[PDB]
Amino acid sequence: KRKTVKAVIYRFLRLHSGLWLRRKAGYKKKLWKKTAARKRRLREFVFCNKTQSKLLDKMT
Amino acid sequence: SSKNLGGKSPGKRFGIKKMEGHYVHAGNILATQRHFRWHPGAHVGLGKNKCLYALEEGVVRYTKEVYYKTFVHVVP
Amino acid sequence: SKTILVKMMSQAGTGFSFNTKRSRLREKLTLLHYDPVVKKKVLFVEQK
Amino acid sequence: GEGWVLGHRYVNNDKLSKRVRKVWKPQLFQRELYSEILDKRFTVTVTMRTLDLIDQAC
RNA sequence: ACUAUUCCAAAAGUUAAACUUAACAUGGACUAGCAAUUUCGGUUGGGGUGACCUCGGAGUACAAAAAACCCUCCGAGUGAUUUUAAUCUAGACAAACCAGUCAAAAUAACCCAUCACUUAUUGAUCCAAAAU
RNA sequence: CUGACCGUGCAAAGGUAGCAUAAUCACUUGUUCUCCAAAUAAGGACUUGUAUGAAUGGCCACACGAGGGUUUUACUGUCUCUU
RNA sequence: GACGAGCUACCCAUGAGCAGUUUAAAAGAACCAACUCAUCUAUGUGGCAAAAUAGUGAGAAGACUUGUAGGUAGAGGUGAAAAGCCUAACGAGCCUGGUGAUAGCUGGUUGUCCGAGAAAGAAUUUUAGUUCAACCUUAAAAAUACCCCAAAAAUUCCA
């Protein structure tokens, strides 16, 4: 049987409809010069593009 | 061999996104420009990057005025 | 002179802001800033 | 659990680095005892630490 | 790993009511001389040498975009003065991926801005730390 | 013309004997002399030795060499020039 | 992991060989046959021969030549030291096994008919390779799209 890639499983979330969800990058460091709004919107989630979502789907 | 040195700068695609007569929506980008080529008119907001946008739903219209200003208006 | 990165801490004991200062300056930065917890402006002092 | 124990050796004892197998052999010394049952003096080259247990086994 | 050391242990002695010695063999770390594994960029009017590698602005690139050359001018990895950017709901620009801009309006509490021509002036993962 | 001598900078100390266009000299086919009717080679000297040097030795040296070069004589199908 | 010093390199043990001539005592010097080497020239160039033959040349009592019995091997040995030799090619032998090592390269990939039909956007220890756009193809649906004049800012838009 196939082995799913854990690298995808940890940081991505698949819904029942097949929609993929990921966290916005850039919040980790160097926030001193960054606007609070930027960080605020980087703390939220975002849906992956269908092309890449399919690739992540094949790995799950 | 070349003493002089310079880099290349990717374009930010400055210009006018919408045209007169077109039906736009509130919050839509009208014209992205450097400094002021044109000025904001009625129902049109100004940005920090000097990019004009539409305040409310309506139609874009360009109007020139001489007292030498160019205003963009949105008519609901 | 140099550049020193510090934080602005309310008397509540938790810094809500992070800013910079000149190394030429010595005395800690003391500035009024809005506090979201108590929901009002409080005096903030410079901390590491 | 002493004779011929072959382990692995590391530098900082945290390895992102090379791991090199290392050999370990027990210490050998002479221990003279006396068996009254067999009426014979015996010589054991066996494990040192084990003798400490034998002393507690009497 | 091998050839020589510094210490604590194995093995022996010493005093008072905690300290000194190494003949053979064998250990734990440790200090030197020996040995063991690989790496050895790209762009390039061949290669090497030299130069260059990311970013911003003004021409090449005539009235919305974008567009190269080892074409051509200047600028940055910041500098300083005062007030201070609190929470989130629409809707758009740009965009292969990833990173970047504008923002009506609602609520809580008051009632960002100037220079370095205007913009530049930075860094995506995993791993560490003043402490959450 | 040259500089026994003097002054000065620098360095740990600044090439002594001897040798030298050399298995070393770029300029170079250095200049002069010998050798030849003609000598970028060879030999003998001169020395501004690009870039000799005293045990990675320096300078010479009888004898020795299937080593590397130069000049007369002798003798030859090497050659004129082949049969 | 093993096989190899019957080739060759060195060494151990045990044997053998090296005319003649001039000469003062001289296994002493020089010349010169055997034997041991391969200086030059020529021939030979799928050969007589995968190291030759002919002329010539060196050593030839010495650090000499040679028989037999032995020793030293590849994370090495040996080497009067050339990066040489170790069974005709050694910058590190050969055999077997790992092994169908790895090759983004190069050389290759077989019957018929029909429809449609590609030459460059940014990145990459990247340029002879990849990942999604710029295209394309199959099978279905919901839309509409273009050539686009004057209202306006070669075009960007729209009857």
**Residues B50, B51, B52: CA angle, nearest 5 degrees:** 115
| CA of B53, C1' of F33: distance in angstroms | 103
| Closest approach of C37 to chain A, Cα-based (Å) | 16
Would you say D2 and D26 are in contact if contact means Cβ atoms under 8 Å apart?
yes
- A 10 A CB-CB count for D44 gives 13
Query: Determination method here?
Result: cryo-EM
Provide the domain count of chain C: 1
φ/ψ of residue B53, rounded to 5: -135, 165
Q: CB of A10 within 8 Å of any CB in chain C?
A: no
Task: Assign residue C20 the CATH number of its domain.
Answer: 2.20.28.120
Q: CB of A40 within 8 Å of any CB in chain C?
A: no
Residue count (chain C): 48
C16 is in which domain, residue-wise?
A: 1-48
Cα separation, A31 vs A22, in Å, equals: 20
How is residue B41 written in tokens? 């008119």
Nucleotide nearest to B21 (CA to C1'): G158
**Nearest residue of C to residue A30, measured between CA atoms:** C18
**Nucleotides in chain G near protein beta carbons (<7 Å):** 132-133, 151-153, 156-158
Q: Which residues pair with A19 in a beta bridge?
A: none
**B36-51 burial, b if ≥16 CB within 10 A, otherwise e?**
eebebbebbeeeeebb
Q: Please, is D41 exposed, middle or buried when counting C-beta atoms within 10 Å of its C-beta (0-12, 13-18, 19+)?
A: exposed
**Nearest residue of A to residue C16, measured between CA atoms:** A36
Q: Tell me the CATH number for domain B1-76.
A: 2.40.50.100
Task: Assign 3-class secondary structure to D8-20.
Answer: EECCCCCCCCCCE
| CA of D29, C1' of G119: distance in angstroms | 84
